[PDB]
Amino acid sequence: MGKSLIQQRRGKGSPTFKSPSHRFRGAVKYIPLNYTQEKTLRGVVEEIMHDPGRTAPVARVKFENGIEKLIIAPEGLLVGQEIYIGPDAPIAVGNTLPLAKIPEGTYVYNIEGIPGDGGKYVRAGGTYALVVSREPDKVIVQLPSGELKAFNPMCRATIGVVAGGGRLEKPLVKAGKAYYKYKARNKFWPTPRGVKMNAVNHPFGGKEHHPGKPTTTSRRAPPGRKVGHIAARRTGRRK
């Protein structure tokens, strides 16, 4: 029958479906080598740079341990800003402190998933999380999705919004310019439609128009059968 499909190739490490990692220069960590606590650490905004690999603004921060690492830029940033880390940091835009010291109702980004790993959530350009509710048991944060997630208040996070936006998703205009975005990322494009790709290539279609099986597929089905609407709970929008 058929062979490995388009997603199945990605996982292999195939080079058409592998990101370049040498025109990339990203990542952000708050230095978890000195834990969440400890005021020992301050830095200076060294530069506002373009990160080529996230196609986004980034800020370079130069620490007083003498280490250069990126922190995701706020809006309104200007070089020569001071960023402070530790609980002894003042509550200010572009300063980083644990959740407990952060009051509710303020825009926040770059929150840790698990305490001491430099962020695992909210690292996207122009996108920001809002601190809705705070309890010393657990601090509830409102995600870019809209979903309230509970976090432990030992986690670090920074005050402000993330700079840019309208510049990480704007009109593609034409095929040439669209193409330039997919080299900056990794998505398989141009990709044809399954409906008139053979029943060897793809479960649906034939040579003619007509599907072969319905789009929405079981969640308990094996690999190599995740096509169409994958784990859908409902479909369409009109009768």
Residue 11 binding RNA, by CB under 7 A: yes
CA distance 99 to 131: 9
Q: Identify which of residues 78 and 183 has a Cβ nearer to RNA in the complex.
A: 183
Residue 183 binding RNA, by CB under 7 A: no
Q: Identify which of residues 43 and 205 has a Cβ nearer to RNA in the complex.
A: 205
Q: Identify which of residues 35 and 90 has a Cβ nearer to RNA in the complex.
A: 35
Stretch that binds RNA, among 13-21, 75-83, 88-96, 99-107 (CB under 7 A): 13-21
Binding residues for RNA restricted to 190-219, rule: CB under 7 A = 190-219
Checking the chain for breaks where C and the next N are over 2.5 Å apart, the residues before them are: none
Amino acid, single-letter form, for residue 132: V
The dihedral built from the CA positions of residue 51, 56, 62 and 65, taken in this order, carries a sign that is: negative
Binding residues for RNA restricted to 16-75, rule: CB under 7 A = 16-19, 21-22, 24-28, 32-33, 35-36, 53-54, 56
82 Cα distance to chain centroid: 25
Query: Which of 87, 126, 130, 134 is in the footprint of RNA by CB under 7 A?
Result: 126
Stretch that binds RNA, among 39-47, 79-87, 90-98, 142-150 (CB under 7 A): 142-150
Query: Which of 108, 122, 157, 163 is in the footprint of RNA by CB under 7 A?
Result: 122
Q: Identify which of residues 105 and 218 has a Cβ nearer to RNA in the complex.
A: 218
Q: Identify which of residues 12 and 90 has a Cβ nearer to RNA in the complex.
A: 12
Residue 87 binding RNA, by CB under 7 A: no
With a CB cutoff of 8 Å and minimum separation 6, the contacts of 221 are none
Contact 77, 122 (CB under 8 A): no
Q: Are strands 129-133 and 139-142 parallel, antiparallel or unpaired?
A: antiparallel
Contact 75, 87 (CB under 8 A): no
Query: Which of 92, 130, 140, 143 is in the footprint of RNA by CB under 7 A?
Result: 143
As measured in angstroms, the least distance from the Cβ of 84 to RNA is 20
Q: How many residues bind RNA (CB under 7 A)?
A: 122
CA distance 107 to 24: 28
Tell me: cis bond preceding 190? Omega within 30 of 0 counts: yes
As measured in angstroms, the least distance from the Cβ of 82 to RNA is 24
As measured in angstroms, the least distance from the Cβ of 69 to RNA is 10
Integer CA distances (angstroms), 188 to 14, 93, 215, in order: 12, 39, 20
Q: Identify which of residues 40 and 127 has a Cβ nearer to RNA in the complex.
A: 127
Return the half-sphere exposure (C-beta side, CA atoms, 13 A cut-off) of residue 189.
Answer: 13
Amino acid, single-letter form, for residue 122: V
As measured in angstroms, the least distance from the Cβ of 10 to RNA is 5
